[PDB]
Design a protein around this ligand. Structure first.
Ligand SMILES: O=C(c1cn[nH]c1)N1CCCC1
Length: 185
């Protein structure tokens, strides 16, 4: 792809984080802690899952960023509406305001309803995410495999400002402690 010139500097919004997450000083990395991280509750925090939003809001234009997923067993990545549900149980779908892909149990899937199987020959260590607001497109790229396309959501109905979306996943196995990291431009 040739989307690299739309690169944006994303930072994580601490206030939106699940209370078990640990965000680095530079707000560019996040991981699952082994306990509650001693923060007050608020209406923005994702309560049920290890999720956090980017601070940036997008309502126009073309945006691109990259995320490091090295040695993780489970994660979700993409964008979501600013007004997505924070509390309780929900599925990741465009109907609920999410445009995402994930790794789970050794398979990659796009967060459609129902979910779509992805075909990845080279397990990615870094993912590129491209949003074209006006076109209604969210695309995912395999940076480890020379930028090859993973998935495109088209005919997106954003219906609001968009925020970068992250889920570090649970660590029931002891094999998923590694962070998500926003990669430098
Ligand atoms: O944004 C949407 C959508 C949201 N509500 N209804 C449709 N889609 C992305 C892929 C095709 C459906």
């Amino acid at each position: 792809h040739h989307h690299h010139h739309h690169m944006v500097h994303i930072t994580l919004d601490r206030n939106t984080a699940n209370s078990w997450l640990i965000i680095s000083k530079d707000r560019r990395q996040v991981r699952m802690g082994d306990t509650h991280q001693n923060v007050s509750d608020n209406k923005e925090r994702f309560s049920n899952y290890p999720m956090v939003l980017g601070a940036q809001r997008f309502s126009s234009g073309k945006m691109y960023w990259e995320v490091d997923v090295t040695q993780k067993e489970a994660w979700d990545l993409g964008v979501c509406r600013d007004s997505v549900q924070r509390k309780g149980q929900f599925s990741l779908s465009p109907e609920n305001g999410f445009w995402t892909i994930w790794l789970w149990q050794d398979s990659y899937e796009a967060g459609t309803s129902p979910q779509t199987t992805l075909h990845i020959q080279v397990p990615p260590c870094q993912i590129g995410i491209f949003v074209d607001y006006e076109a209604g497109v969210v695309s995912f790229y395999n940076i480890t495999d020379h930028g090859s396309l993973i998935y495109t959501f088209s005919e997106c109905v954003f219906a609001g400002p968009l925020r970068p979306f992250f889920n570090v996943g649970f660590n029931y196995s002891g094999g998923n402690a590694a962070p998500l990291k926003l990669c430098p431009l």
